[PDB]
Amino acid sequence: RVDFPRSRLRFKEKLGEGQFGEVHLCEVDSPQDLVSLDFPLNVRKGHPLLVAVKILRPDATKNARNDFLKEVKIMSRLKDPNIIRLLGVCVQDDPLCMITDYMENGDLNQFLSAHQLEDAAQGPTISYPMLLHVAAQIASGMRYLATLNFVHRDLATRNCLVGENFTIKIADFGMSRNLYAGDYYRVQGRAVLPIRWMAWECILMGKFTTASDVWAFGVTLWEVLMLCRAQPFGQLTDEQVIENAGEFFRDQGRQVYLSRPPACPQGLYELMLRCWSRESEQRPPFSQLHRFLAEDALNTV
Ligand SMILES: Cc1ccc(C(=O)Nc2ccc(CN3CCN(C)CC3)c(C(F)(F)F)c2)cc1C#Cc1cnc2cccnn12
Ligand SMILES: Cc1ccc(C(=O)Nc2ccc(CN3CCN(C)CC3)c(C(F)(F)F)c2)cc1C#Cc1cnc2cccnn12
């Protein structure tokens, strides 16, 4: 438990900005000097060590600082191939920083927007099996979060990151990266919520659980199979999305569901529909979602 040396973080560019600070892409100066029990980092000789750095504005309120430190504690526990990894912190003096691995292909929404489905769309291709592999990795990371008794609360392709060889890491940007403002609705005062990804019980009663994470996974998987080309419920206004949550509650058959993506087979679609069951206990666990995507869907190509 010692700070990473801030003087070794060499700025390259801004990855995001928000009310309370920024995210920077940095290079670690001569990273081999640091390798030890205290910092057992992975350096590849001949390859720069790139890292992402979340930084709190030095004039932040005391409550903002407590938020940042709480996030540090959470991140310090996360150790999984499909979750973003904490490499070090700077917290003994200001500005507070947290340092993670850098995912070189950006967020999953950006990534998939730039791809087309393997045979006018443009750019590099991505196959249907590769899309199942992207989704399986998200289910695997979420399964791990759930076993540690964490609820994500904002699962969407915008909070997933892409590294080498189609590797996905779940992340959560909170207010550090004010992209995608069009995905959040202002329900009260200064509070904005990702209503198009939220289970009806989240919207009506502010109840967030692994089962509402499963509901958001359904929507995220719909995004993946659509190659991020369309907003969920894009035919409906925000106020109509809220009304739709009310119809899940009323349960009289007026509720509407996201349509089957063209690249989605009927069984996978029926699994997505189960993610949107009215009753929490009827939604599939992430173990079952992962298995379906890694086995069933693959064996029936
Ligand atoms: C510097 C940095 C700091 C922090 C985080 C961050 O993701 N923190 C986080 C906090 C909590 C949770 C879990 N909880 C969620 C809430 N929940 C209520 C409790 C459970 C998780 C999660 F991944 F587990 F979800 C992540 C990401 C970055 C980044 C970066 C980066 C790296 N490559 C790139 C390339 C382009 C852009 N950015 N970027
Ligand atoms: C129509 C409608 C529109 C908007 C909102 C709304 O603003 N919901 C809201 C959800 C969550 C949060 C955030 N949370 C985080 C964690 N926390 C532990 C709970 C707070 C907030 C926030 F404002 F606090 F951000 C608001 C609610 C309704 C409703 C309803 C309702 C309730 N029972 C019934 C029965 C029949 C019909 N409707 N209905």
Author numbering: 602 to 720, 732 to 913
Text from the published report:
The discoidin domain receptors (DDRs), DDR1 and DDR2, are unique among the receptor tyrosine kinases (RTKs) in being activated by interaction with the extracellular matrix. A single transmembrane helix links to the cytoplasmic domain, where a larger JM region precedes the catalytic C-terminal kinase domain. Overall, DDR1 displays the classical bilobal architecture of a tyrosine kinase. As observed for ABL, both type II inhibitors induce an inactive conformation of DDR1 characterized by a “DFG-Asp out, αC-Glu in” configuration.
